[PDB]
């Protein structure tokens, strides 16, 4: 009744204005998307392009879409299940936040949030052991995100 027509326009906003470091869109399912993001140059992820699995909820506008990773990463706010410690989706999820805006907030992840230690072993390393953190992040970058 209302669910689908938002998605088409949010997708066509890509055709009207392509993004800088990302891309979006579906296979054939409307609610099954596959996003894109490339590791920032000013970050150990550099040299990494990521594969994303997206399933929209019953309401993409009225509810935050759960997002999972396909490519393994070495980051505190990310586990092996691709769970994203983005504070927008669960706390300040506005209906007006576009999928592009959500992709931008993902691209903000880079800036790690230490108070959310999804993997505390990596969180403490970010707290004190940034050198090996940066080395191993690029290690896994070249391992998975070619």
């Amino acid at each position: 009744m209302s669910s689908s027509k938002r998605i088409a326009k949010e997708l066509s906003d890509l055709e009207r204005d392509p993004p800088t470091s990302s891309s979006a869109g579906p296979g054939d399912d409307l609610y099954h998307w596959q996003a894109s993001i490339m590791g920032p140059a000013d970050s150990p992820y550099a040299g990494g392009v990521f594969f994303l699995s997206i399933h929209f909820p019953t309401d993409y506008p009225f509810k935050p879409p759960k997002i999972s990773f396909t490519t393994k990463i070495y980051h505190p706010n990310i586990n092996a299940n691709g769970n994203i410690c983005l504070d927008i989706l669960k706390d300040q999820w506005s209906p007006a936040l576009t999928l592009s805006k959500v992709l931008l907030s993902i691209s903000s992840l880079t800036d790690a949030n230490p108070d959310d230690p999804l993997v505390p072993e990596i969180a403490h390393i970010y707290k004190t052991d940034r050198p090996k953190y940066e080395a191993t992040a690029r290690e896994w970058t070249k391992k998975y995100a070619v």
Binding site: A24, G25, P26, F50, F51
Partner: peptide, 8 residues
């Protein structure tokens, strides 16, 4: 060269 289209 590695081409990416919609994460593919």
């Amino acid at each position: 060269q590695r081409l990416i289209f919609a994460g593919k």
